[PDB]
Symmetry: D2
Subunit: 343 residues, 4 copies
């Protein structure tokens, strides 16, 4: 077993054909364009491999055994480390000027990055919903794909996404049981009391400060009490402005507030990594847009791509938005030894 055979370099290093040269007009920088995309695709393959392995752990029930949490978080962390490298990798393609790109751009049609099967599979397997995607040229993204590739993309839409698998796990988070620690019941009561206490403090001296604090209080009150409005949540779900079930949201908040408790330490890291992956995917899209602009100019692909840099494409937006519902520590329902050892 030789290095080159083990790595199948007879394939990897014989996959570089310049279209400019095939048409009798070799342009040096086309080689860079090819390699860059090939490297992205290798790493997309690796991300898919990690992500599919994690989906499997959830889907088959292995995640129920908490011994598997280290591997889950290590692999999700690994995805974010790869995505960071992929963001940095744009720095290489930025050494190609727009003038040099323009010398071989004509030979590219009818190819586009849009046709990256793996990029789509990745979006779908994380949990981008087809109905929420921004249309390209007034049409669905999958119409750009055909045959088995179209079929694979459909499977990736219909099979359970990372979002759905995490959701189901969040729904089982310990502590939500009304008969048990009764997290939600206690949280509602403590926030009500907390707000009442604050109001009383505010009620007494009249000044600019008071005027502001009253307004702030009213806004904070509206936000925090809205958390207990399950109907509003259902409505925002139907519009796609939220993604997690109400119960899963409760699970996530339980993990956030009790993160230090031993059984929640690695789960909290997992939630953190999920947000990280969303943020890095967005950064990838942002860096991609800025580079399309520098190469093709304004006037559109550019405008479509800019539209993808939105909360529409943030699958774990609900994990980000839990910051909105932070409260002072002393309002958090206490978890003393009496009710401590369940975690």
């Amino acid at each position: 077993l030789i290095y080159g055979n083990y790595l199948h370099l007879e394939k990897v290093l014989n996959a570089q054909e310049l279209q400019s040269e095939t048409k009798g007009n070799k342009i040096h920088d086309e080689h860079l364009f090819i390699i860059t995309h090939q490297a992205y695709e290798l790493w997309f393959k690796q991300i898919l491999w990690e992500l599919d392995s994690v989906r499997e752990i959830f889907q088959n029930g292995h995640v129920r055994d908490e011994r598997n949490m280290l591997k889950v978080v290590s692999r999700m962390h690994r995805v974010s480390v790869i995505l960071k490298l992929l963001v940095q990798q744009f720095s290489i393609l930025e050494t190609m000027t727009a003038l040099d790109f323009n010398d071989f751009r004509e030979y590219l049609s009818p190819a586009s990055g849009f046709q990256s099967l793996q990029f789509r599979l990745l979006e779908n397997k994380i949990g981008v919903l087809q109905n929420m995607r921004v249309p390209y040229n007034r049409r669905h993204y999958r119409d750009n794909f055909k045959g088995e590739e179209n079929e694979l993309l459909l499977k990736s839409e219909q099979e359970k996404t990372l979002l759905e698998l995490v959701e189901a796990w969040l729904e089982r988070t310990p502590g939500l049981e009304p008969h048990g620690f009764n997290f939600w019941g206690k949280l509602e009561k403590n926030i009500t009391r907390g707000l009442e206490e604050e109001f009383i403090r505010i009620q007494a001296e009249e000044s600019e400060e008071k005027e502001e604090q009253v307004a702030e209080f009213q806004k904070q009150k509206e936000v925090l009490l809205s958390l207990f409005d399950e109907k509003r949540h259902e409505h925002l779900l139907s519009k796609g402005e939220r993604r997690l079930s109400y119960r899963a949201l409760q699970g996530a908040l339980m993990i956030y507030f009790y993160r230090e408790e031993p059984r929640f330490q690695v789960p909290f890291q997992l939630l953190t990594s999920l947000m990280d992956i969303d943020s890095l995917m967005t950064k990838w899209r942002y860096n991609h847009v800025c580079m399309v602009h520098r190469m093709l100019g304004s006037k559109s692909g550019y405008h479509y791509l800019r539209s993808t840099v939105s909360d529409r494409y943030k699958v774990f937006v609900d994990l980000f938005n839990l910051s909105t519902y932070l409260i002072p520590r002393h309002w958090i329902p206490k978890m003393n030894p009496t009710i401590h050892k369940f975690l």
Copy 2:
């Protein structure tokens, strides 16, 4: 064609075969090990493509037309940007623990990085000398290679290296003509006078401070005057402690000292990027070492051999680094009045 066909993804994305799985014992992390190496090899191919294009510009005479210096420096800069990414790329393989690596390491034998043809081609084309390589297991590096691969490696050794092509260009640097700006003659004269003047000043509170300055002066004097010792240079060349001809060294120093002159601005950037490539190659080797250590331990010695590769022995453009040693006060630098400037 369409994206997948244009990029020949039917090849690139069907090149992942886990030996652990071929032997009925699939280990998840083996996939990462394969992809990481495949990505390194794609970028090595790109570096070779840039470097060969630059060697060709020198070798075919195009570099003589100074309009081509922007392309030369852009491509060398591009090599450095790729190397930076390759250094950062170790962060991905560091997400594999030694315990997990140990689950599939057995299936790797007898394969090794030592068998990376492209890495060797890159070393050779930059200018690593075979006689200066540290031996591993009392073995020649090319012993690990056979067939047309061994042939390619031989060509890479025998064809002109980047070092040699840069050397030849440096030897033609304007300003060295004895009948012209006479850089070397004037520099020797100015440094001699400069040192004499300083000595006189030092000759003055008759204290240990004076003594210390005396000692420093004597050391600085020895260093600076050694620059004009062409025989010493030839001797250090024969040992491989320097690499550039004496004349090329003079060219480089001309570019260093007159870097702001318009004809030397982009040449100076080129010299800077050559040093950058040497620094980044060494950084790659160092990051590689630290990772071998974390995975195999000090015992498994590859670790120690690799530590040895982090040495000036593997720095092709060491002469460009060492020109820092011969910095002098600005006012000692032979003046280039616009009248003379005209040539630059």
Copy 3:
């Protein structure tokens, strides 16, 4: 001269006071928040130092001596290396969770990043226009500043910006002289001829959907390229702030783009590249800042929304340099510069 004295560490390392601790409730992560900002501010000071030195080289005429172009480009390159580090530096503040931030956030009011004098000085000196700034809570940016700080900001608004100094230099670019190489006149003629030739080819084809598509594309390309020679349209887009460089400076920039390999234009071209780099890195700084405000405060608190608005071409000072990609033409249409004239671009 000792290290600590030379670096005035008695100042730098005695500037960390946690408000949480001043109010009898020390919160560990506040220290990180202070240091992070202090490090940003040190690097902003360094960016201002480089940028002021480069402004001065332009303003005082030193840039006319082309010996100084290496220093100009090295310092602008240095600014972009610093900005890259500043973008990476957000990775440190991302190790603070929103829950931990929430424990000391109350002690921060009424302080805000908006009160960073240096950040505003940097924006102004590069060339962000006051009239183009997006209002925050229907307020002017300078109203958050008073006394000498307000005065400094005003000077930074009134003094020549990097954009204006680069503009003036671009207007002097060799090759534009109608009596000389006559770049503009020749470019207009070559593009007109080039378009005419292309039209004839397409016209020769037989009516088809494909031919229509070619005709449509041709018509778009034609409109774009010929719009470049419409000086009045340029003046109009200037007045709206959709462009920033004078028409003549735009000509200079395109001259440098197309003739970048000519010796006198090699370092100028790198300068143009570094100016675009600085714009892109500034935007990336703003973007990374936004994403982190979101993670800490949530969708509304909107700060998030105002900051998202700052990530726009409205804040890109060198937008015109980016948009020269729009006007790329086949290489063979570029007016030739044989040695006959090339000598004017030798040095």
Copy 4:
């Protein structure tokens, strides 16, 4: 307060005095040299703040409550994120050429990085032992310091280091109890049996060079693995400074390595990983510092050579955590921990 007051910018941004300018010969790049060091020192202060807080958690017994492990690992992780930035930060000082550095270097004497209090405090608090430091010009590092600074450094040497505090915690790792899971007893037995089995396998092979090699390899691997159970060899390697951890702490570390997926060991394993990360990044810092001294001053006691000697395992405090890779065995040799005996490692 206001931003500038809160961050004490009246201190931070009035700490830049160029010695070149004080002596009537301002050199532009000296400003960069000052700011770069000031930024390093801010981040050293932050690293000390995190490291001291973690030492305190160990020293005061708080680490005994496993609820605190998340905070411990987040802060050590944060130290490694800062160190990574500090490694990248050399890229800024690399935009200063040796020629430009040479224009102001004369004004620096007698200041040096050697005089960084915080850098020494950091080395000492992690656990660099004074007896293992390479001497520079045959002098102790502390001799470069006086007054309160010398006193601070003494405290840093005499107080419990991170190494010592982690050692004590590792010694208490669950599973080592002879009367309990008896990890060490079982590991010795399983490795002995494992080696016997392997010997039989190889001996069964047909006479071949491959067999001969496997024999030799086996003999080497056998010596290595069995040497682990030689506590006297360990004491000897301790004396020479080739190991740093007590024998029992090493057992704890290996317990965590092999049983990392067990819930109680998941975050402990991450801690071990972060300790190695910090050591690797400290070494990378020293390496990048060396390469830059070389680029500025040339090959030439020679600072270069002293510094090069610092880039070695003698300055890696947690070298033992790296070297546990030497003692990896097939998974199936690891003493089994069924739920029957799994209970003690469940939260």
